[PDB]
Design a protein around this ligand. Sequence first.
Ligand code: TXQ
Length: 332
Amino acid sequence: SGPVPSRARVYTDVNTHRPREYWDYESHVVEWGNQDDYQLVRKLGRGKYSEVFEAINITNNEKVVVKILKPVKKKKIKREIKILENLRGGPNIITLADIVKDPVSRTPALVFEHVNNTDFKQLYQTLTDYDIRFYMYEILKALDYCHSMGIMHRDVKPHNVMIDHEHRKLRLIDWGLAEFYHPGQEYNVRVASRYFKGPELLVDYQMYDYSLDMWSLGCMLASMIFRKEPFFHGHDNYDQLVRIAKVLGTEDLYDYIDKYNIELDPRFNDILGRHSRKRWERFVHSENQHLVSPEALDFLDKLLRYDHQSRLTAREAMEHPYFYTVVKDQAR
Ligand SMILES: O=C1c2ccc(O)c(O)c2C(=O)c2c(O)ccc(O)c21
């Protein structure tokens, strides 16, 4: 037989209750602006499939960000604009300000309001125990909002979280892999970035949901508290799952496979072996122990589960004891 089906435990049917227009992005009609409204200042970096520049809107002297898109299918560009439009103004979501083409090259680009940050490569090292709870909290607000709106991000990782540490603000960026959740849909598993891929993607289970983003969050949490970036460091997709199996063990992994009747690629037979599930204390040492607490480990353990159904939802994650003091500090 084939694989056993699966549904999200929350927000299962929110797209069904919307007008078709909200999620039927193939039919979205885009009005394209003129890129001559913007003068590029400097190259800032790259998205998953784009080049990103600092620019100035000359009509109002406003600082913006210009993301010039690499040639991708026309419906994927529609998908990202529609998702950005649907999510605009929500907590911690990057704000799309305009859409343009370079009049000469025809090439499409998205214009975001400017947000300044400190690179994660520099930042993580400086973070206090409190700071990790704080920003994790802020991330979880962006995830619960997008999940509640019918949308999985599908590329959660440190590069995609811009933190203005000076002002204690954060934005979730790069929505070019995000999709609408619909019960029963079978999604492409070639998404996310290797170290942050859920076991669902690695074993080729196509009927996944919001809970994918929560695995990615847990990978991030693990790198921050153990001071090890990235936490699961595989060389390719297969070895990514060997490295998880040596932490979480092989017993739950095979129970996982049995439950959903997943056909394992024969290539996994000899490399996976047989591994016990390890106690988190193994990763604690003198450089990181100030960030590790019984509260941190309980939370972490409830994110990193093979069985996607059994991971915390964003909203549950926000009710965890690990966040009690940030909740108290906030409101107010
Ligand atoms: O603001 C974005 C930004 C805003 C929205 C995006 O979708 C995005 O990919 C980026 C982005 O990749 C980026 C970057 O790679 C380097 C510096 C940045 O300021 C950004």
